[PDB]
Each structure stands twice: as structure tokens, then as C-alpha cells.
């Protein structure tokens, strides 16, 4: 019934050629629920993004997608959080997870950017602090630690995808739960997903 969460941001690059990257596994997910929720979102200079507000279990939501680089995300999730009022605590930025596989998905508390590039930037932009909330997408990982780059701005095969795609469809049920129900039973669900 009581939940933390005020802003959702999905991480993305910008354009017709990065939309189905691995990189924007985020934004796939703010994209999704945007459709279930018929909201359109607007193109806001101000805010560096893509935003829009819905309203779940009586709950108001904000959603961003930034349209700045990757690496400059903190831009656009900082203009809009001190606009709206919105702490760092109360924020979920969704993103891909190196260190999950194809299929699962996590909500998680806080902790270090692990190498991503958005996730560093925003920590930064919020006044170097950690303690918002992700949505860590599974993306898998490269067998060889100088390829993490070309493997995130790759596009998944095929099969890899439907397992992506479905992931991010649980977690948009689960980010549903998350308004109703909270925290607690929206991460007791997600987090015995998989994908198979």
C-alpha cells in the first residue's frame, strides 16, 4: 500500500539505431508500461528526455527516458527530479545488468554502478549518491571483459531477445505489484522469474 518509488527511468542511447541494443534494456521496460498505461510521452528539452506521468492503484508515477548519451543520463534524471521534488531514495532507474543472464530481472537498493556508464552518471548528478532504487535487466555478458562495450551496443540473437522480452514483461507486472502491493511482494515475485 506505502511505496518508495516516485520516478521510473529506463537508461537508453537515443535514436532509431540503438532502440533494440542490449544498452536500452531499461527503456524497453518504460516503454512497455507507457503502452499498457496509454501514456504518450513527451519530447522535454528541459528535462533531456522523454517523460511522462501515469497514475497506478491510485498512485502517481512519473517516467523518463533521457535522449542524452548514455553516459550523460544524470542530466536528464537530475533536471527532472529537483523539478518535481523527487529524492534519489525515491527513485528506480531500470537498466541492463551485465552480471544477470537473458530472463531474470532484480530490484535492488542502492550499490555501485558496476562499469555502467548511466548508472556512474547518475550517481554523480545526484549529488554522488548511490541510494536509488534499479530495476537490473539481464543482458548477460561477453566472454572476454574488452568486448563489454561491443556486447551492449550489439543487438541480442533472436532466441536471446525472447528471453529479454520476456523479463521485461514481468517486470512490468511486478512494477505494477510494486504500486499495489509494494516492495517486498513486487521482489518476492520478480526475483523467482526466469525465463525458460
Known amino acids: 500500500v506505502s511505496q518508495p518509488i516516485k520516478l521510473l527511468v529506463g537508461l537508453a542511447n537515443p535514436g532509431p539505431e540503438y532502440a533494440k541494443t542490449r544498452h536500452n534494456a531499461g527503456a524497453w521496460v518504460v516503454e512497455e508500461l507507457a503502452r499498457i498505461h496509454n501514456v504518450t510521452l513527451k519530447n522535454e528539452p528541459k528535462f533531456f528526455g522523454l517523460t511522462g506521468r501515469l497514475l497506478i492503484n491510485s498512485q502517481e508515477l512519473r517516467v ?3 535522449t542524452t ?10 533536471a527532472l527530479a529537483n523539478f518535481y521534488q523527487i529524492k534519489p531514495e525515491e527513485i528506480m532507474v531500470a537498466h541492463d545488468e551485465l552480471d544477470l543472464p537473458p530472463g531474470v530481472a532484480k530490484f535492488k ?3 555501485g554502478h558496476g562499469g555502467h556508464n548511466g548508472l556512474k552518471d547518475t550517481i554523480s548528478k545526484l549529488g554522488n549518491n548511490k541510494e536509488f532504487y534499479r530495476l ?3 543482458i548477460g555478458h561477453p566472454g572476454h571483459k574488452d568486448k563489454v562495450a561491443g556486447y551492449v551496443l550489439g543487438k ?3 532466441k536471446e531477445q525472447e528471453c529479454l522480452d520476456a523479463a521485461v514483461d514481468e517486470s512490468v507486472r511486478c512494477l505494477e505489484i510494486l504500486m499495489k502491493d509494494g516492495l517486498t511482494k513486487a521482489q518476492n515475485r520478480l526475483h523467482t522469474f526466469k525465463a525458460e
Request: hydrophobic share 50%; charged share 10%; glycine share 18%.
Open 64 to 66: 523518463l527516458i533521457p
Open 136 to 138: 537490473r535487466l539481464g
Open 156 to 158: 541480442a540473437p533472436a
Open 109 to 111: 537498493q542502492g550499490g
Open 69 to 78: 548519451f548514455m553516459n550523460l543520463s544524470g542530466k536528464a534524471i537530475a
